[PDB]
Design a protein around this ligand. Structure first.
Ligand SMILES: [Cl-]
Ligand SMILES: [Cl-]
Lengths: 299, 299
């Protein structure tokens, strides 16, 4: 058995995300764990819990490379994949890997991808192992990788961000509730730079949220921790997005992590939207990049 | 690291218990997993999930020795302990070991015990391993054992059984509901050979259950599967037992596993009751000895 790649995290790195994972736990359960190698020499490897949200949404519970302690790709650059991924809910078992992985009592978490010496050009298995606080307890999980998929966190690299608005906790819940009220319907999201307003409509139903302008462009907004939670926004263009009410509801929920993050809506020139979890200055330097992509939903 | 004991179960042996465990998982979760070494010259090692039920009850989900494929004790009889135990809910972990151990897809299950070559009469750690159907997935859990405890399935060795009555579904359920209604009070259970009836009182509340006599003593009854389910009993002496209503309710619930078992109440001369899960001929030959001991409880 040969090792294709080795990935190991720093002491207790992933444990600080324990509560964050718990918040997203229910949505991440039926998804998959995925390590993005496609960005190894672009910051480092990126492990992420990836799953669906609603009728047209993709969650990416991603860990910043800052959490990585050692990376090793033993395959020729040309053989290694852009990404490997196994399913979060391990084969047969009752244990959800993401839960154990992002556990708070884990000192060292690490992954090892293997293949059989003979036939097979790409990794075929992964071996997660978590070593706990007690300096005594270990857990090793051997799983089969899945049919290759691109890095979830790769679908927006060529997209153009025309603005993003921070949603104050109450506003977020308010929207999140409205979205839920719309069931399996669609929501037409409207960004109006002129009116400093974001609008959502689903049939006759409707909802309007105002926002204070930031005398700065999209890409220069919310670059660091969110020091204040207020309905603020940096928009530089109009746009209408057709998303699924249910996906929007799940996103707003997941990105508002108690005492940790507040939802930030990122608008793209194409009809696409990405609800991002803006980290509060309080919740320290969590190596988290949580987002949910709202795909185009034909109503 | 020195290996003291090794236990390997037969292929798929513990998987047949999958639904049975699930039926008790809520109770077993906070208990412990434990291997009774005493029963090695009495059929073989006995693994059991052991936990508390109500205010005065001990639950024992024991696996018949005929499920074990290979046992090896590498310690002299002097050093070897009577029983080894470790938390069912693994340390800092999120999965309960028992849930994964009795997984329906576990091809092979095995346990190993170790200790350091210094200070330590008995084993200090255990390593459970699960090999799955897919012939690819494996799980290894390494834990610390707990301060030693006697084999749960031993507390009834000197006790002399004076009677046992089987309860059919509708009957058991009446008793269980009655017990839950008595909330946190105590139940005075009476066995009357002259009136062929068992009575339950908790304050002004009461309940009487008739049973048809078996022309055989206590120890020769319900030896094998129970092809039918009718309120019959092989009693042979009066006895009044003081039990906790909540333990009684839990015990009846646990021993009536849907389409698998029916509760059987075993009364002992000492006024102690043990609720047992009589297996229906319907269920196959499950290697399961589930029971719940109702200890003495005062008003
Ligand atoms: Cl209970
Ligand atoms: Cl010792």
């Amino acid at each position: 058995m040969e090792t294709t790649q080795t990935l190991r995290f720093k002491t207790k790195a992933l444990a600080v995300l324990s509560k964050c994972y718990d918040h997203a736990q229910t949505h991440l359960k039926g998804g998959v764990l995925q390590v993005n190698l496609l960005s190894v020499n672009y910051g480092g490897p990126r492990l992420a819990a990836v799953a669906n949200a609603g009728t047209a949404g993709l969650i990416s519970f991603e860990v910043s490379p800052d959490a990585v302690a050692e990376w090793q790709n033993h395959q020729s650059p040309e053989e290694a994949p852009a990404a490997v991924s196994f399913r979060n809910l391990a084969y047969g078992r009752t244990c959800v890997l993401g839960k154990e992985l992002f556990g708070s009592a884990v000192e060292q978490a690490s992954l090892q991808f293997y293949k059989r010496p003979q036939g097979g050009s790409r990794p075929e298995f992964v071996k997660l192992t978590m070593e706990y606080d007690d300096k005594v307890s270990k857990s090793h999980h051997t799983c089969a990788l899945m049919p290759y998929m691109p890095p979830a966190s790769d679908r927006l690299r060529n997209e153009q961000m025309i603005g993003q608005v921070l949603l104050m906790p109450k506003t977020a819940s308010s929207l999140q509730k409205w979205a839920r009220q719309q069931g399996s319907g669609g929501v037409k999201v409207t960004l109006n730079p002129d009116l400093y307003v974001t609008t959502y409509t689903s049939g006759e139903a409707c909802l309007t949220l105002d926002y204070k302008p930031l005398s700065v462009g999209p890409y220069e907004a919310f670059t660091g921790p969110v020091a204040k939670a207020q309905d603020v926004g940096a928009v530089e263009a109009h746009v209408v997005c057709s998303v699924a009410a249910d996906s929007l509801a799940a996103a707003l929920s997941l990105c508002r992590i108690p005492a940790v993050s507040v939802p930030i809506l990122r608008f793209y020139r194409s009809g696409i939207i990405a609800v991002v979890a803006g980290l509060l200055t309080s919740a320290g330097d969590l190596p988290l990049d949580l987002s949910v992509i709202l795909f185009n939903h034909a109503s």
